[PDB]
Design a protein around this ligand. Structure first.
Ligand code: MG
Ligand code: MG
Ligand code: MG
Length: 90
C-alpha cells in the first residue's frame, strides 16, 4: 500500500461517499476535497458568514462532536480527522 493513502473510518467514509467519492482509500487531499464538497453542496456554511459551518443535526456534526466550527480555526475539524483517518505515515 502507498504511503500517501489513508483509510477513512466508517462514519467519515459515509460522508465522503455522500459527496460523490468512490472507494475506500484516499489521499488526504481527496478527503478534504470531498468533505468540502459535502459542506458546500448541502450548504452547511452560514451563507452570510461563510467560514462558519453549522453542522449540528447532521452526521458531520455528530462526527465532529460540535454544533458548529469555523474554517478559519480548524483545530476541531483536524481533531476529527486525526480520530477518523487510518494512516501508515503515522
Ligand atoms: Mg473518488
Ligand atoms: Mg480504494
Ligand atoms: Mg490542530
Amino acid at each position: 500500500i502507498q504511503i500517501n493513502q489513508v483509510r477513512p473510518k466508517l462514519p467519515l467514509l459515509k460522508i465522503l461517499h455522500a459527496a460523490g467519492a468512490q472507494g475506500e482509500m484516499f489521499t488526504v487531499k481527496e478527503v478534504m476535497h470531498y468533505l468540502g464538497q459535502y459542506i458546500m453542496v448541502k450548504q452547511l456554511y452560514d451563507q452570510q458568514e461563510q467560514h462558519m459551518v453549522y453542522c449540528g443535526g447532521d452526521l458531520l456534526g455528530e462526527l465532529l462532536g460540535r454544533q458548529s466550527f469555523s474554517v478559519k480555526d480548524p483545530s476541531p475539524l483536524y481533531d476529527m480527522l486525526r480520530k477518523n483517518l487510518v494512516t501508515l505515515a503515522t
